[PDB]
Amino acid sequence: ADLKAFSKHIYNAYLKNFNMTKKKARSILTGSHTAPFVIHDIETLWQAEKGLVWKQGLPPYKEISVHVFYRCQCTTVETVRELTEFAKSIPSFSSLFLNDQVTLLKYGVHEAIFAMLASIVNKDGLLVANGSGFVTREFLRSLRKPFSDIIEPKFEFAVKFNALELDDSDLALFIAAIILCGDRPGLMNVPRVEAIQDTILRALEFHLQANHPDAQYLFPKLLQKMADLRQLVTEHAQMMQRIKKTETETSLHPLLQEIYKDM
Ligand SMILES: COc1ccc(Cl)cc1C(=O)NCCc1ccc(S(=O)(=O)Nc2nnc(C(C)C)s2)cc1
Numbered sequence: 001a002d003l004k005a006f007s008k009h010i011y012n013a014y015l016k017n018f019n020m021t022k023k024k025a026r027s028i029l030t031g032s033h034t035a036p037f038v039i040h041d042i043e044t045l046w047q048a049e050k051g052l053v054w055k056q057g058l059p060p061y062k063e064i065s066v067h068v069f070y071r072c073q074c075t076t077v078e079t080v081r082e083l084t085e086f087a088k089s090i091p092s093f094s095s096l097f098l099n100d101q102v103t104l105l106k107y108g109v110h111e112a113i114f115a116m117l118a119s120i121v122n123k124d125g126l127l128v129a130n131g132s133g134f135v136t137r138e139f140l141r142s143l144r145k146p147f148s149d150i151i152e153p154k155f156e157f158a159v160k161f162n163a164l165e166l167d168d169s170d171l172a173l174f175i176a177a178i179i180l181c182g183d184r185p186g187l188m189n190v191p192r193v194e195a196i197q198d199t200i201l202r203a204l205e206f207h208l209q210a211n212h213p214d215a216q217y218l219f220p221k222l223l224q225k226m227a228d229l230r231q232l233v234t235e236h237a238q239m240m241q242r243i244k245k246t247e248t249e250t251s252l253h254p255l256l257q258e259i260y261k262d263m
């Protein structure tokens with residue numbers, strides 16, 4: 001009863017904080033939705049940059065690989081900010097000690113970003129420019145190493161994740177559970193974190209029961225994906241650290257350096 005209303009509240013805050021929903025993404029990738037402009041090479045990328053409207057700008061005078069790397073960074077930073085406002089809409093999150101709130105966001109944001117990233121990806125590429133662009137996976141592998149390497153595993157994770165067929169209402173709860181994880185390092189009051197988590201997790205288990213009646217082992221399967229995202233994020237961080245040391249003409253945004261750093 002209260003769980004059902006809890007889940008609805010989390011879902012609304014998710015809808016309030018993130019513009020691209022899985023529902024919208026899927027109705028675009030599948031086809032009242034015009035087909036997105038396909039970015040498959042440098043020319044189409046340049047045209048997409050000139051023609052489409054994006055949320056922002058980037059450093060000028062950069063080779064393509066690096067330029068695309070900064071676009072992604074800029075998008076990551078914006079989602080970190082959306083996730084920060086969303087976690088503030090999670091009942092009690094704002095009750096935690098300041099250090100804990102920070103610690104949860106620091107260690108959980110990329111996990112949430114990668115779970116949500118799947119909504120806009122298929123095996124062939126992903127939506128960009130808020131759904132008006134579609135960048136092909138082949139075009140991305142055609143970029144310079146090590147930049148062509150960052151994304152492949154996100155694609156691998158996404159295609160497996162998408163087979164679970166979650167919808168926005170499931171994802172909103174999944175994302176709160178990821179942020180309210182009691183296993184982060186340096187947590188001060190973990191019992192207080194796990195108390196808020198258990199509520200979200202109870203709301204989720206029940207929610208999936210209602211929303212996926214003919215899917216028996218979905219709940220635990222979801223908790224396992226959380227394990228997958230954590231490994232995905234550890235790898236991603238190492239990739240960034242190496243690019244940082246290996247690519248002198250590139251730099252990590254301040255807020256992102258502060259995240260990849262400690263982890
Ligand atoms: C691959 O993403 C893009 C590729 C080309 C163009 Cl024109 C735009 C985007 C974009 O807007 N991405 C925003 C969403 C996004 C953000 C981060 C990531 S990532 O976590 O994989 N980090 C990456 N950093 N650089 C990357 C490039 C060099 C592939 S991937 C993937 C996707």
Ligand SMILES: COc1ccc(Cl)cc1C(=O)NCCc1ccc(S(=O)(=O)Nc2nnc(C(C)C)s2)cc1
Pocket residue numbers: 254255258
């Ligand atoms: C902004 O954070 C700081 C603010 C004052 C001082 Cl004395 C130090 C830091 C710092 O070392 N933060 C490192 C971690 C961090 C860096 C940047 C960002 S942000 O860019 O997302 N927010 C900012 N807003 N304004 C900023 C500049 C103009 C100070 S940074 C978040 C987190």
